[PDB]
């Protein structure tokens, strides 16, 4: 690996927003972490409508 290609790889990292400083891969885990992000209502509604005289 030439020094030229290394400095250019970290330049392209600057361009595309990738981490310029190589943080191995172990510390990169939080990069992945931050990359991503009712029986009740049914139940009373049936029984609530029931004593009003329109459900069963």
């Amino acid at each position: 690996l030439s020094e030229y290609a290394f400095r250019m790889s970290r330049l392209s990292a600057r361009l595309f927003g990738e981490v310029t400083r190589p943080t191995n891969s172990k510390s990169m885990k939080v990069v992945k972490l931050f990359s991503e992000l009712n029986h009740h209502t049914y139940a009373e509604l049936m029984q609530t409508l029931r004593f009003l005289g329109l459900y069963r």
Binding site: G17, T23, M28, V30, V31, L33, L37
Partner: protein, 122 residues
């Protein structure tokens, strides 16, 4: 001769009440729906149906934010250490946040502020 020519008075030349007056005006042309197209038209005017051609981000603007607020979040790292290991940790944190398409800028800023706090107690 038509009734539109002749003598005239010659007198002149050239809140809740308004709300209910306009609502009563609406009743003048309040007819039952006459076919299905009319039903779809009324529903979409009411905001019931989807707009076509369908726009998957309809009704959402992300608070009018621009991309540079989502991609470049390192201006929230000014109050942190500039060269220690918190600079490493927080620069990498904001790199992670800048790749999150599910969050708005406000949540990202609040999250960065929480780290601000947490390190300051510590």
């Amino acid at each position: 001769k038509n009734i539109f020519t002749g003598k005239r008075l010659n007198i002149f030349d050239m809140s809740l009440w308004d709300v209910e007056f306009a609502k009563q005006l609406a009743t003048v042309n309040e007819q039952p729906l006459q076919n299905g197209f009319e039903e779809l038209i009324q529903w979409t005017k009411e905001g019931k149906l989807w707009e076509f051609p369908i726009n998957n981000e309809a009704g959402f603007d992300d608070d009018g934010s621009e991309f540079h607020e989502h991609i470049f979040l390192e201006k929230h790292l000014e109050s942190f250490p500039k060269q220690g290991p918190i600079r490493h940790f927080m620069e990498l944190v904001t790199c992670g946040l800048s790749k999150n398409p599910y969050l708005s800028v406000k949540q990202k800023v609040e999250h960065i502020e929480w780290f601000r706090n947490y390190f300051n107690e510590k």
